Amino acid sequence: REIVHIQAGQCGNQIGAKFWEVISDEHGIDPTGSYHGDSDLQLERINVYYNEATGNKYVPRAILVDLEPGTMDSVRSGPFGQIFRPDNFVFGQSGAGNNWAKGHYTEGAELVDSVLDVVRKESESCDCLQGFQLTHSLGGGTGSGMGTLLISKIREEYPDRIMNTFSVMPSPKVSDTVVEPYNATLSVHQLVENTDETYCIDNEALYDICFRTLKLTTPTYGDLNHLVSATMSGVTTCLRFPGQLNADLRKLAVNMVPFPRLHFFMPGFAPLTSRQYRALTVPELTQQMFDSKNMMAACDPRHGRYLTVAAIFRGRMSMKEVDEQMLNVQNKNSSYFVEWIPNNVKTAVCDIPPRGLKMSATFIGNSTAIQELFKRISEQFTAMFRRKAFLHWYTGEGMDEMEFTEAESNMNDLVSEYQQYQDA
């Protein structure tokens, strides 16, 4: 039933704030935590993401984490900043310097116990906690290092709950520092071991979508996070809205993940919006949402095969038409769905559409073409590591080249595992 949400770092916190804005709107809750919507469906499962507080108030079940207070202060002064309980703000002062080692091993260890204290408080006030979702980036310092540190701690104290993460993958087209491959790779090693399901949100993809199709000449982090909050609302609708399929995080893990390591999901959204007037038809929605140009992970789906697919349709539309269209895609492209998992595409419908849309479609694909992402990172890792470039920032915090070698190997193994089933 209850979900405990964590956002860590600059990137984590920014996309998390946007997520809470969006779904707080969708459920009729205003920046003060007072419900002001009209319908019923908005409150049926409100507790999955919100706690009820004195005076019929709704408080998001969310913990904000960082090693520097800059972005946390920004959130408090931000639109919904006063919807969170202030005690759930857990921050350091020193920062993590884009350094995975600082976030995992030195600066973040100092702060991790208090974060877990707040987590504990939030969980013991749960009737039946299903698990955790963590938003963070894999190229930074706090997000990647300290978030993966959080995650394995959480796994230790709650080993029978679901760990789910929204993970933003670094890209040179949208890059803060050169050590971002290193951080990413060291994180992926963690994730492949301690998450049940991970949404790979590629910044490369988000950039290309803002540029090639939304026609934004200079994309800002904001333009990128608008796509992200769109995608997050999509992929959690079946969690927070009452439907025929009455879904939670563990069912999603069970049905989407054939093998425990291959839990890296390619998300997609349609229609692609910028910060229109023409209603999309269900056939349009359905073959935009499958389009490579609508996926937030930069990989060519035609370059591998789908292991599983979940497809959500938001808005008032023809269940019959959605059924027919989904079936036309599968039956017209059955090359790209593995035949050893029968009926591997499932569809859900939610009457409520997102803000500003009559109808939308959100896509969650577990495809072997995700390997492309990791290969990309691994190449970028190696070009530096074969010269031990920039390593001193890490060995300065106590790390050994050996750890790097092990992370690299594990990600390469992950890529091979995906390649094993792309040909089965």
Partner: protein
Amino acid sequence: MEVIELNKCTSGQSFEVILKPPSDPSLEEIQKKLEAAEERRKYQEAELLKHLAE
């Protein structure tokens, strides 16, 4: 084709029509199985936790 054993009452009747003649484990073992799987589970959890300790 002959009609046999017609039994009839105020709610209905029933009859037969012939057209041609003819040409567990114990409570013990069950709780043992349930507890066996609990043990494997507790062992996988211990394996995990020791690893996390490492």
